[PDB]
Design a protein around this ligand. Structure first.
Ligand code: PC1
Ligand code: PC1
Ligand code: PC1
Ligand code: 3PE
Ligand code: NDP
Ligand code: ZMP
Ligand code: SF4
Ligand code: SF4
Ligand code: SF4
Ligand code: ZN
Lengths: 126, 208, 114, 96, 342, 157, 48, 146, 178
C-alpha cells in the first residue's frame, strides 16, 4: 500500500532546473584522473571524477581576462565508484564517455639485477 | 602536557557512548548506527521514517530532554543512492549536552517534517527545501526562503554551478531588470589544491 | 523496480493533480495581467502556461510529476500573493534574449558551440 | 627606457603596444596611457657588480628580514658573474 | 581582418560582436535604444556627446566594462569628428532636431553635420556608414526639415558612396515625440486636426524595431549602398490614430477641424520658445504630411526584423498619461483603429 | 566673450553651489558598508556638518549611497527606489560588493556590481571603505557636480 | 618628516600627484600581455 | 616541446584569391559559397582529395562522404602504402599486428627499412627495454644508424 | 553566577512619603526633566567632530589601503612572479601571467588586481615572500568610473613608486610583529 512500481530510467532533468542546452548538448567524461608525472604520489588517482566538455574561452576586450559563456566549466564531481558515476549521469540526463581505470602494472624489481654476471641489466654507474 | 595538541577527556566519551547504547536499545526500530567521534560528539543515524519518533523521544524523554533544536541542515554527497544526508543538531539545557541525528533522502523521497516537534524546523526545512530540493511532508508552508523569486534549481546541490545559470541586469529597452544566461568577464579559475601524498593514515581506505 | 510514492499511486491521479493546477493557473492569468501592469494580453499568459506544461509533458514518473505539481503550486501561490513582480513574471518570455537558431549553418557561423 | 611606437603610443617595459589599426586605442583617446618610467632591466644595467672574495656568497637582498629569502650563489665560472635569483644583484669572485 | 575585431562569445554582455560603432545621436531617443542593442550584443560603442555627462549618464550601463567610450565632440569641430571616428568600422548618424536654434538650423543639422561626419569617416577608412534620414524625404516637400534631409541624403551619398540610408516613419516609443505628443494634446480643450484628421495616412514604427534594423544593417553584408524604409505593419488615418491614442489613454476625445495655415501659425507661436518647444510649424507640417507607400525599397523584413504592431506596443507609452481611474486597463479594453490599404 | 555667457556661467555656478551644498542621501543601506555609512554619520565625521542629511523617502533624496551587496532578490527594489527619485539624482557605489560584486563576484545570487542596474556616478573602493573614504567620496561627488555646466550647455545649444 | 625624513630613492616621485579621476591625466586600464597566436601571412605574389 | 608551434603560422580566418591573385580574408559564407559553386561545377573524376598527417578520422569520413556524393574516388593520402595484392583491403597488411605488448613478449626482432629511434621513439624505447630485460636479438636491414 | 535585571527584591510597601514621591514623579515629570538636563550637559560639552579634510582620522602602521608593488633599494621590482598572492587571494582578484625577462629573471608581464573585487584583507601582503605586494595606507582613491578602479601592473608599480616614502617606513615600524 506504500510501494508502487516504476519501470523507467529515473529522469530528474525537469526537477534539476538546468536549461535544455546544458542537458542535451553536453558530454561528460567519467574517469579516474591520471597521475601527473611531475610527482610520484598517487593519492589523486583514487576517486572517480566526471568533468564536462570544454567550451569556448575568449579574451576580454578591456583587460584580456579569460572570459567564458558556460556555467559548467569548473564543474568537477567526485564519486567512489564508476557505477555510481553512471547512475548520477543517467539520472541527470547527461551523455557520458567512460574511461576504464588505468592501474599500474606490477613489475619485478630486484637490486641484484644491477650487478649481473652475464645479462645486459648490469648498470655501469650508481 | 603537549602545548600544541588539544587535550582530550575520556569521561565525556564514555557518557556519550553509554547514552548512545541507551537510545539504540530504546529505539531499535529506526536507529541504524550510533557513533561517538574523537571530538566527544554523539551521532545517531536513523531510518527516514523514524525522524518523528526519534525527535519526539529525544525532546520529551526525561533522561534526554533535548528541548532545543540547534540547527537543521543537509549535506549533498552525490555518490550514494540517497544523496542528501539530513542533520539535526539538538541541545539539552537540562543535562548540558548536544546530540546529532542523521537521516537520508534522495531527490524523490520526502521525509516527515518535525514542525510539530520544533517550530524552528519550519524555517530550517524551508531552507533545506530551497537549497537542496528535499521535500518535507506535512509542512505548513513549504516554499523558497533564500533564492530569488522564480529561481530555477537548487543551488546548494553539488551539480549546480557556483556562478549559476542566469544573471540580472537592467535593460533600458524594456525598462526592467531581466535575466540573461551566464557570461563572465573573468572566469572563476578552478584550483587543484590537492596533494597526491596521503595526509592521514588513520583514514586510509582499502583498495577497490 | 519498486519505489515509494509521494502523493499519487499511479500516473492518472498525478494527471488529475496536473489538470487541477492548470485550472488554477488559467484562472489566475487574467488576475495577474490586470493587477501587475503587464504588456502581455490574457492570451499570451495562457499560451505561456500551456507552453510550460507542454515543456514538462514528457514526464511519466509519478514522483517527478508530483514534485512538478508541488513546484507549480508554489509558483502559483507566489503569483497569488504578490511576491513575484513585473520583472519576475516577464522573465518567462525571454524578450531580451536573442535565441540561438537550431540549424547547423547558423551554429557554424556563430561559433564553436554545438 | 620608454620608447614610442610608429603610432605614437609609448611602449611599456613588458614590450606591448597596440597596433596602428588596433581599435583599442580609442580607449586612450582624450585620456592617457600611463607607463612606469623606471625600467627594472636598465635599472639593473646601471647596478655595479659586487666584488667579493668567497667562493660561495649569500644574498638576502639587504635589510635582513626586509629582503628576500637568503640564497647561496656559487662563483666558479670566470666567464660569467653570479646573479641572485631574487634581487638580480651580480656577484664576482676575485682572481687577483 | 584584424585579430581584435574577430567576434567571440555567445552574443551576451561580455561577448565580442566584432563591431566598433561610433554613434553620433546616441543621447537622443533612438540613440539610447541603438546603444542598448549594441552593448547587449557586446560591442565597442563610441559615444561622442555634446551635452552634460549627467544627461548622457543614463547610457553608462548599456554595456560591459570598457565597451563604451564617451568623448566630447563639437558639431563645428572637424578635428573632434575625426578623432571620434578614427577607430571604428561602423559609423551611425542619428543627429537631428525637431526645431531650429540660433546656433544650429535645419540645413546645418541635416546637411552640414552628416556631410562632415561622412567625410571624416571616409578619410579615416571606415567600411560601414549608416545614416538615418526620414521617410518621404524625396525632395521639394512642404516642410523645411524634409527638404533639408533630402539634400543631406544627396550630400551623404556624394561623399560616402556606399552609405546605408535608413528612412524610418514616425517612430513611436516610450520617450518619443509622437505618441507622447498626441497624448499631450489632452492638456488643451480639443484636438486640432487639419481636415478633421482625414486625408493623412500614417504607419508608425517601433523604436526597438528600428534599432534592431540598424544593428542588422551593421552586420548585414548585402545592405551596403542601399536605402531601407522602416515602416510599421499597418497604415492608419491620422484621425483614427489620434482616436485610438485617446481611447488607450482613456482621457476623452473632442476633435476639431482647424485650417492648416492658422495651425502652422499657432505651431510657430509655440515654437518661438527658448526651451524645447511643445510644437513647431515644421512639426505640424510633418504631422500633417501623409506617409508614402514603400514599394521598391527594402525594409525591416528584408533586413531581418519583424515589425511589432502599435496595438501590441502601445500600452508601455500611454499608461503614463492615463489617470488613476483607468490605470489598470488591459489591451483589449480599447478598440484598435481601423487600418487603410492606401 | 559676450556679456550673456558670463551671466549664464555665474547663475550656473550658483545653481551648482546650491545643489552641492544641499545633498540628501536616501536612508538606504545593505550590509557592512551601511554600518560604515552610519559610522560616517557618527559625530566624528559629521555628514550633517558637511550638509548631508538622511531622508527616508526617495522623493526627498538626492544622492543614493548603494552601500553593500546587491543580490538578485534585491536588484528590482534597487532599481525601483532609484527611479522614484526626482530628476537631479546622483549615485555613489560603496564597497567592493556594490562596485563589482566583491567577495561574492562568482555567486549565483549576487549582481556583479550595482552599475549593471543603476547608473553609478562615483565609486568608493574598500571592504568596507572607512568613513574617511566615504567622506572623501562625498566630497568628490560635490566637486563633480560643481564641475557640470547645464545652463552653459543650454546656452550653447 | 623634517627631523626624520624618509629614505631617498631615485624611483620615488619628486612631485606628488593628487587623485586625477575625471581628468585627461586619469589611469586607463589595458592588457600588458603581448599577442599570443600569430596569424600566417600570405605572400604578396600571385601564383599565375 | 613542439606544442609552441600551435602559437605561430596559424590560419584563423578563411581566405580567398583576389581578382589580381592574392589571398585576402573573407567570410565563411563567401568561402563556402565559392568552394560549393566550384564543386557543383565539376564532376566526379574532376574532383579529388588528398589528406596529410595531422588529420582526424571524422574529417576523413566527412570528406569521403562528400566526394562519394559527388562520385569521386580519388581519396588519396600523402603517405604511400602498396595498393596491389591485399593492399588496404585486409587490416593485417598495414598494421603493427604484434603490438607493443608483443614487443615485450618477442625474443627476436628484425627491423627492415626503418629508423625506429626517430620514427617511433616510444616503440624504440620499448625495443630497448625488452632488449635490456628479456635479451632480444635485434637485427636491421637498412643504413647503419645509431 | 547570575543576577536579575528587573526582578525587585520583596515589596517596598505603601508609605505616605513614598506615595507622595511617586505622585511627584508622575505629575512633575522628574525623569523627563533629568533626561533634559543630561542632554543639556551634552550641549555644553565639546564636540568630537574632526575638521575633514584638514584633520584626518588617526590610523596605524598596519592599515590596509590601496595596493602597491614595491622595489628593492637598487630599484628592481621585488615581485618574482611566484603567483602565491594569486593562489591565496580569497576573492580571486589577482591575475598573473609571466615569462622569463630579457636577462633571464622571472618577472610578471601581467599583474592585474581587480580592486572592485578585492576585499582588502592583506592575505597577499602576508603571503608574499619578498614583500612585493603591499597595502599602502591610501584610502582616498575613489573614482568616477568602474574601469579605472581595475588596476594593472603599470598602475600598481606606479603607485608603489608614489607611496614608497611611507610604505617602507610603515613596514619598518610594524615588520617586527609579522
Ligand atoms: C529662494 C527660493 C526661490 C528660488 C528661485 C530660483 C532662484 C534662481 C533663479 C534663476 C536661475 C534659475 C535656473 C534653474 C534651472 C534648473 C534646471 C536646469 O538647470 O535645467 C537645465 C535645462 C537645460 O535644458 P537643455 O536644453 O540642455 O536640455 C536638457 C534636457 N534633455 C537632456 C532632456 C534634452 O534647462 C535650462 O537650462 C533652463 C534655463 C532657465 C533659465 C531661466 C532664467
Ligand atoms: C509653558 C511653560 C513651561 C512648561 C514646561 C516646559 C518644560 C518641561 C517639558 C518636559 C518635557 C515634556 C515632553 C513630553 C512628555 C510627554 C509625557 C508626559 O508628560 O506625560 C504626562 C504624565 C503621564 O503620566 P503616566 O503616563 O506616567 O501615568 C500613568 C498613566 N496611565 C496608567 C494611564 C498610563 O503626567 C501627567 O499626565 C501629569 C500632568 C500634569 C499634572 C500637574 C498637576 C500639578 C499639581 C496640581 C495641584 C495639586 C494639589 C491640589 C490641591 C491639594 C490641597 C491639599
Ligand atoms: C522646566 C525644567 C526645564 C529643564 C531645567 C533643567 C533640567 C535639569 C535640572 C536638574 C535635574 O536633572 O533635576 C532632576 C530632578 C528629578 O530627579 P529624579 O527623577 O531623581 O526625582 C527626584 C526624586 N523623587 C522621585 C523623590 C522626586 O528634577 C527635579 O527635582 C525637578 C523636576 C520638576 C520641575 C520641573 C518640571 C515642572 C516645571 C513647571 C513650571 C515650568 C518652569 C518655568 C519655565 C519657564 C520657561 C519656559
Ligand atoms: C552668486 C553667483 C556666484 C555663486 C558662487 C560661485 C562660486 C562658488 O561656488 O564658490 C565656492 C565657495 C566655497 O564653497 P566650496 O568650494 O564648497 O568650499 C569648500 C570649503 N571646504 O562658495 C561660497 O563661498 C559660497 C557662495 C554663496 C553665494 C550666495 C548664495 C545665496 C545666498
Ligand atoms: N523622432 C522621430 O519621430 C523620427 C526621427 N528620425 C530621425 O532619427 C534621428 C534620431 O531621432 P531622435 O532620437 O528622435 O532625435 P532627437 O531629437 O532625440 O535628437 C537626436 C540627437 O541629435 C543630437 N543633436 C541634435 N542637434 C545637434 C547639434 N546641432 N549638434 C550636436 N548634436 C546634435 C542630440 O544631442 P543632444 O542631446 O546633446 O542635444 C540628440 O542626441 C534624427 O536624425 C531624426 O530626424 C527619423 C524618423 C522619425
Ligand atoms: C503569466 C505567465 C506565467 C507562466 C507561469 C508558468 C507556470 C508553469 C507551471 C508548470 C507546472 C508543471 O509543469 S507541472 C505539470 C507537468 N506534468 C505533466 O506534464 C504530466 C505529464 N504530461 C501529460 O500527461 C500530458 O500529456 C498532459 C497534456 C498534461 C495530459 O495529456 P493527456 O491527454 O495524455
Ligand atoms: S564590500 Fe565588504 S564591507 Fe562592504 S558589504 Fe561587501 S563584504 Fe561587506
Ligand atoms: S607579488 Fe609576491 S606573492 Fe605575488 S607573485 Fe609577486 S613575489 Fe609572488
Ligand atoms: S587584500 Fe585579500 S582580496 Fe585583496 S588582493 Fe590581497 S589577497 Fe586578494
Ligand atoms: Zn638577493
Amino acid at each position: 500500500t506504500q510501494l508502487i512500481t516504476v519501470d523507467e530510467k529515473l529522469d530528474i532533468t525537469t526537477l534539476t532546473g538546468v536549461p535544455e542546452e546544458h542537458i542535451k548538448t553536453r558530454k561528460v567524461r567519467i574517469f579516474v584522473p591520471a597521475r601527473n608525472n611531475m610527482q610520484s604520489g598517487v593519492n589523486n588517482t583514487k576517486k572517480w571524477k566526471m568533468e564536462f566538455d570544454t567550451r569556448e574561452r575568449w579574451e576580454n576586450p578591456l583587460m584580456g581576462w579569460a572570459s567564458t559563456a558556460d556555467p559548467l566549466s569548473n564543474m568537477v564531481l567526485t564519486f567512489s565508484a564508476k557505477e555510481d558515476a553512471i547512475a548520477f549521469a543517467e539520472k541527470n540526463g547527461w551523455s557520458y564517455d567512460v574511461e576504464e581505470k588505468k592501474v599500474p602494472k606490477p613489475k619485478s624489481k630486484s637490486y641484484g639485477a644491477n650487478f649481473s654476471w652475464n645479462k645486459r641489466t648490469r648498470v655501469s654507474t650508481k | 602536557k603537549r602545548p600544541t595538541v588539544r587535550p582530550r577527556s575520556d569521561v565525556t566519551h564514555k557518557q556519550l557512548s553509554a547514552f548512545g547504547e541507551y537510545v539504540a536499545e530504546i529505539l531499535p526500530k529506526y536507529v541504524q548506527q550510533v557513533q561517538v567521534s574523537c571530538l566527544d560528539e554523539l551521532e545517531i543515524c536513523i531510518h527516514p521514517d523514524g525522524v518523528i519518533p526519534t525527535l519526539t523521544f529525544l525532546r520529551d524523554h526525561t533522561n534526554a530532554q533535548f528541548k532545543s533544536l540547534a540547527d537543521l541542515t543537509a549535506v549533498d554527497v552525490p555518490t550514494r543512492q540517497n544523496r542528501f544526508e539530513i542533520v539535526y543538531n539538538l541541545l539539552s539545557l537540562r543535562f548540558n549536552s548536544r546530540i546529532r541525528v542523521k537521516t537520508y533522502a534522495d531527490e524523490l523521497t520526502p521525509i516527515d517534517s518535525i514542525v510539530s516537534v520544533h517550530i524552528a524546523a519550519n524555517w530550517y526545512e524551508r531552507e533545506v527545501w530551497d537549497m537542496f530540493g528535499v521535500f518535507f511532508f506535512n509542512h505548513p508552508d513549504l516554499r523558497r526562503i533564500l533564492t530569488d523569486y522564480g529561481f530555477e534549481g537548487h543551488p546548494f546541490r553539488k551539480d549546480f554551478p557556483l556562478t549559476g545559470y542566469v544573471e540580472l541586469r537592467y535593460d533600458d529597452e524594456v525598462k526592467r531588470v531581466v535575466a540573461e544566461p551566464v557570461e563572465l568577464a573573468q572566469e572563476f579559475r578552478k584550483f587543484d589544491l590537492n596533494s597526491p601524498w596521503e595526509a592521514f593514515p588513520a583514514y586510509r581506505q582499502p583498495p577497490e | 523496480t519498486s519505489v515509494k510514492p509521494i502523493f499519487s499511486r499511479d500516473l492518472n491521479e498525478a494527471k488529475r493533480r496536473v489538470r487541477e493546477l492548470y485550472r488554477a493557473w488559467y484562472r489566475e492569468v487574467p488576475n495577474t495581467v490586470h493587477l501587475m501592469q503587464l504588456d502581455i494580453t490574457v492570451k499570451q499568459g495562457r499560451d505561456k502556461v500551456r507552453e510550460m506544461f507542454m515543456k514538462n509533458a514528457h514526464v511519466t514518473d509519478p514522483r517527478v510529476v508530483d514534485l512538478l505539481v508541488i513546484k507549480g503550486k508554489m509558483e502559483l501561490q507566489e503569483t497569488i500573493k504578490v511576491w513575484k513582480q513585473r520583472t519576475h513574471v516577464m522573465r518567462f518570455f525571454h524578450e531580451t534574449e536573442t535565441p540561438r537558431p537550431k540549424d547547423f549553418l547558423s551554429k557554424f557561423y556563430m561559433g564553436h558551440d554545438p | 627606457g620608454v620608447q614610442v611606437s610608429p603610432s605614437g603610443e609609448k611602449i611599456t617595459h613588458t614590450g606591448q603596444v597596440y597596433d596602428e589599426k588596433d581599435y583599442r586605442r580609442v580607449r586612450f583617446v582624450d585620456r592617457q596611457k600611463e607607463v612606469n618610467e623606471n625600467f627594472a632591466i636598465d635599472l639593473i644595467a646601471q647596478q655595479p657588480v659586487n666584488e667579493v672574495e668567497h667562493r660561495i656568497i649569500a644574498c638576502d637582498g639587504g635589510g635582513g628580514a626586509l629582503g628576500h629569502p637568503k640564497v647561496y650563489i656559487n662563483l666558479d665560472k670566470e666567464t660569467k658573474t653570479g646573479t641572485c635569483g631574487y634581487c638580480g644583484l651580480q656577484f664576482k669572485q676575485h682572481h687577483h | 581582418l584584424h585579430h581584435a575585431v574577430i567576434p567571440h562569445g555567445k552574443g551576451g554582455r561580455s561577448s565580442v560582436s566584432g563591431v566598433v560603432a561610433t554613434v553620433f545621436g546616441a543621447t537622443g531617443f533612438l540613440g539610447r535604444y541603438v546603444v542598448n542593442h549594441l552593448g547587449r550584443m557586446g560591442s565597442q560603442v563610441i559615444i561622442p556627446y555634446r551635452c552634460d555627462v549627467y544627461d548622457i549618464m543614463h547610457l553608462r550601463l548599456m554595456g560591459d566594462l570598457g565597451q563604451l567610450t564617451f568623448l566630447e565632440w563639437d558639431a563645428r569641430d572637424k578635428d573632434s569628428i575625426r578623432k571620434a571616428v578614427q577607430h571604428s568600422n561602423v559609423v551611425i548618424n542619428l543627429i537631428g532636431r525637431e526645431w531650429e536654434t540660433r546656433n544650429f538650423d535645419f540645413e546645418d543639422v541635416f546637411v552640414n553635420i552628416p556631410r562632415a561626419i561622412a567625410q571624416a569617416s571616409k578619410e579615416a577608412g571606415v567600411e560601414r556608414f549608416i545614416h538615418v534620414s526620414h521617410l518621404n524625404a524625396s525632395m521639394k516637400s512642404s516642410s523645411k526639415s524634409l527638404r533639408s534631409k533630402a539634400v543631406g541624403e544627396k550630400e551623404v551619398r556624394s561623399v560616402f558612396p556606399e552609405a546605408i540610408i535608413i528612412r524610418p516613419s514616425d517612430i513611436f516609443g516610450r520617450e518619443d515625440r509622437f505618441l507622447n505628443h498626441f497624448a499631450n494634446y489632452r492638456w488643451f480643450l480639443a484636438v486640432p486636426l487639419v481636415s478633421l484628421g482625414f486625408k493623412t495616412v500614417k504607419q508608425p514604427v517601433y523604436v526597438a524595431d528600428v534599432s534592431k534594423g540598424i544593428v542588422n544593417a551593421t552586420k548585414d553584408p548585402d545592405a551596403v549602398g542601399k536605402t531601407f524604409a522602416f515602416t510599421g505593419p499597418n497604415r492608419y488615418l491620422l484621425f483614427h490614430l489620434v482616436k485610438y491614442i485617446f481611447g488607450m489613454t482613456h482621457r476623452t476625445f473632442i476633435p476639431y477641424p482647424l485650417p492648416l495655415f492658422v495651425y502652422s501659425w499657432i505651431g510657430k507661436l509655440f515654437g518661438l520658445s527658448p526651451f524645447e518647444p511643445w510644437t513647431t510649424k515644421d512639426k505640424v507640417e510633418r504631422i500633417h504630411i501623409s506617409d508614402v507607400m514603400p514599394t521598391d525599397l527594402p525594409g525591416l523584413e528584408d533586413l531581418g526584423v519583424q515589425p511589432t504592431p502599435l496595438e501590441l506596443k502601445s500600452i508601455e507609452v500611454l499608461r503614463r498619461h492615463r489617470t488613476y481611474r483607468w490605470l489598470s486597463s488591459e489591451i483589449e479594453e480599447t478598440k484598435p483603429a481601423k487600418t487603410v490599404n492606401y | 566673450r559676450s556679456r550673456a555667457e558670463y551671466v549664464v556661467t555665474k547663475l550656473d555656478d550658483l545653481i551648482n553651489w546650491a545643489r552641492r551644498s544641499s545633498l540628501w542621501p536616501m536612508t538606504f543601506g545593505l550590509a557592512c558598508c551601511a554600518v560604515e555609512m552610519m559610522h560616517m554619520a557618527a559625530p566624528r565625521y559629521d555628514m550633517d556638518r558637511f550638509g548631508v542629511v538622511f531622508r527616508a523617502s526617495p522623493r526627498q533624496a538626492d544622492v543614493m549611497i548603494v552601500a553593500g551587496t546587491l543580490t538578485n532578490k534585491m536588484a528590482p527594489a534597487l532599481r525601483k527606489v532609484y527611479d522614484q527619485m526626482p530628476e537631479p539624482r546622483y549615485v555613489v557605489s560603496m564597497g567592493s560588493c556594490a562596485n563589482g560584486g566583491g567577495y561574492y563576484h562568482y555567486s549565483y545570487s549576487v549582481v556583479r556590481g550595482c552599475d549593471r542596474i543603476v547608473p553609478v556616478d562615483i565609486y568608493v573602493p574598500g571592504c568596507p571603505p572607512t568613513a574617511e573614504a566615504l567622506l572623501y567620496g562625498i566630497l568628490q561627488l560635490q566637486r563633480k557636480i560643481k564641475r557640470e555646466q547645464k545652463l552653459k550647455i543650454w546656452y550653447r545649444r | 618628516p623634517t627631523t626624520n625624513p624618509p629614505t631617498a630613492r631615485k624611483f620615488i616621485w619628486t612631485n606628488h600627484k593628487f587623485n586625477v579621476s575625471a581628468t585627461p591625466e586619469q589611469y586607463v586600464p589595458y592588457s600588458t600581455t603581448r599577442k599570443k597566436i600569430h596569424e600566417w601571412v600570405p605572400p604578396s605574389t600571385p601564383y599565375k | 616541446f613542439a606544442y609552441d608551434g600551435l602559437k605561430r603560422q596559424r590560419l584563423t580566418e578563411p581566405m580567398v584569391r583576389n581578382e589580381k591573385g592574392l589571398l585576402t580574408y573573407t567570410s565563411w559564407e563567401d568561402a563556402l559559397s565559392r568552394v560549393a559553386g566550384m564543386l557543383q561545377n565539376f564532376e566526379g573524376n574532376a574532383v579529388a582529395a588528398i589528406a596529410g598527417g595531422l588529420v582526424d578520422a571524422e574529417a576523413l569520413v566527412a570528406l569521403k562522404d562528400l566526394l562519394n556524393k559527388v562520385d569521386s574516388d580519388n581519396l588519396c593520402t600523402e603517405e604511400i602504402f602498396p595498393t596491389e595484392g591485399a593492399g588496404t583491403d585486409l587490416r593485417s597488411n598495414y598494421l603493427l599486428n604484434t603490438t607493443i605488448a608483443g614487443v615485450e613478449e618477442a625474443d627476436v626482432v628484425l627491423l627492415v627499412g626503418t629508423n625506429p629511434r626517430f620514427e617511433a621513439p616510444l616503440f624504440n624505447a620499448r625495443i630497448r627495454k625488452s632488449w635490456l630485460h628479456n635479451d632480444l636479438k635485434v637485427a636491421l636491414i637498412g643504413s647503419p644508424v645509431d | 553566577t547570575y543576577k536579575y535585571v528587573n526582578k525587585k527584591e520583596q515589596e517596598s510597601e505603601v508609605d505616605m512619603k513614598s506615595a507622595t514621591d511617586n505622585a511627584a514623579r508622575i505629575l512633575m515629570w522628574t525623569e523627563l526633566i533629568r533626561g533634559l538636563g543630561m542632554t543639556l550637559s551634552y550641549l555644553f560639552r565639546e564636540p568630537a567632530t574632526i575638521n575633514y579634510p584638514f584633520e584626518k582620522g588617526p590610523l596605524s602602521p598596519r592599515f590596509r589601503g590601496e595596493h602597491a608593488l614595491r622595489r628593492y633599494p637598487s630599484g628592481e621590482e621585488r615581485c618574482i612572479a611566484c603567483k602565491l598572492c594569486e593562489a591565496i587571494c580569497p576573492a580571486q582578484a589577482i591575475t598573473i601571467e609571466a615569462e622569463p625577462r630579457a636577462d633571464g629573471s622571472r618577472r610578471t608581464t601581467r599583474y592585474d588586481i581587480d580592486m572592485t573585487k578585492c576585499i582588502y584583507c592583506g592575505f597577499c601582503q602576508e603571503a608574499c615572500p619578498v614583500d612585493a605586494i603591499v597595502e599602502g595606507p591610501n584610502f582616498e582613491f575613489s573614482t568616477e568610473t568602474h574601469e579605472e578602479l581595475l588596476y594593472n601592473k603599470e598602475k600598481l608599480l606606479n603607485n608603489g613608486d608614489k607611496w614608497e616614502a611611507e610604505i617602507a617606513a610603515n613596514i619598518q615600524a610594524d615588520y617586527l610583529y609579522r
